[PDB]
Design a protein around this motif. Structure first.
Motif, mmCIF file in Angstrom:
data_model
loop_
_atom_site.group_PDB
_atom_site.id
_atom_site.type_symbol
_atom_site.label_atom_id
_atom_site.label_comp_id
_atom_site.label_asym_id
_atom_site.label_seq_id
_atom_site.Cartn_x
_atom_site.Cartn_y
_atom_site.Cartn_z
ATOM 1 N N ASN A 38 0.863 -1.215 0.000
ATOM 2 C CA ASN A 38 0.000 0.000 0.000
ATOM 3 C C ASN A 38 0.887 1.249 0.000
ATOM 4 O O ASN A 38 1.910 1.277 0.653
ATOM 5 C CB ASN A 38 -0.882 -0.001 1.250
ATOM 6 C CG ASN A 38 -2.354 0.045 0.837
ATOM 7 O OD1 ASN A 38 -2.670 0.362 -0.292
ATOM 8 N ND2 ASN A 38 -3.273 -0.260 1.711
ATOM 9 N N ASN A 62 -1.008 2.787 6.250
ATOM 10 C CA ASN A 62 -2.320 2.084 6.188
ATOM 11 C C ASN A 62 -2.226 0.896 5.228
ATOM 12 O O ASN A 62 -2.922 0.834 4.234
ATOM 13 C CB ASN A 62 -3.394 3.054 5.694
ATOM 14 C CG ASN A 62 -2.840 3.884 4.535
ATOM 15 O OD1 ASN A 62 -2.766 3.415 3.416
ATOM 16 N ND2 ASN A 62 -2.444 5.108 4.755
ATOM 17 N N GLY A 63 -1.376 -0.050 5.518
ATOM 18 C CA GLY A 63 -1.249 -1.233 4.620
ATOM 19 C C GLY A 63 0.178 -1.780 4.684
ATOM 20 O O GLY A 63 1.060 -1.323 3.985
ATOM 21 N N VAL A 153 -0.233 0.311 11.550
ATOM 22 C CA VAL A 153 -1.194 0.410 10.427
ATOM 23 C C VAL A 153 -2.450 1.163 10.879
ATOM 24 O O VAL A 153 -2.724 1.289 12.056
ATOM 25 C CB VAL A 153 -1.559 -1.010 9.994
ATOM 26 C CG1 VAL A 153 -2.983 -1.036 9.456
ATOM 27 C CG2 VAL A 153 -0.589 -1.468 8.907
#
Length: 168
Positions: A38, A62-63, A153
């Protein structure tokens, strides 16, 4: 007052989203590998709550990926002395509590001196530091900060305070 780490806290860096982590912050460089599935957000922000000065690197993690080294933000260049002992202090703060980050030091030879990674971070700035001395003879070093973990995350991690200097 000069020091070993330069702009290690984005202090001399003007806010503004980064376009090239490699050539974005002079005191902080970032590098993403194929592990980063991500796309993370690398941008500088200016807040009075900053731990050192008023500028920091607000990242939006976030990933994560299949590797524990997806997003990595190192600080450099740094200036040390052969025989003299230097100090290492940094401040981490994520928009939401429950974030993990890694802050280590090492020269081009991969020779790491200090090591403090795998720690939770509150929504505020946490002052973490330690002491160390040129292990071999590196007049320049850089602390590779790790990023890209599930514990970090779903949370924006702001980093600032990475400085290397001895005490009087």
């Amino acid at each position: 007052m000069l020091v070993a780490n330069i702009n290690g806290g984005f202090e001399s860096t003007p806010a503004g989203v980064v376009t090239d982590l490699a050539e974005g912050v002079e005191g902080w460089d970032l590098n993403v590998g194929s592990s980063v599935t991500n796309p993370p957000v690398f941008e500088v922000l200016e807040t009075s709550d900053a731990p050192e000065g008023n500028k920091v690197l607000a990242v939006t993690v976030n990933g994560v990926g299949n590797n524990p080294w997806d997003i990595e933000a190192t600080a450099f260049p740094v200036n040390v002395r052969p025989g003299v002992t230097y100090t290492y202090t940094i401040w981490a703060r994520a928009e939401q509590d429950g974030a993990v980050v890694s802050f280590t030091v090492g020269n081009q030879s991969f020779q790491e001196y200090g090591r403090l990674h795998e720690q939770q971070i509150t929504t505020e700035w946490q002052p973490f530091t330690f002491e160390f001395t040129v292990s071999d003879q590196e007049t320049v070093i850089r602390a590779p900060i790790h990023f890209g973990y599930a514990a970090n995350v779903g949370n924006t991690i702001y980093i600032d305070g990475l400085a290397i200097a001895s005490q009087p």
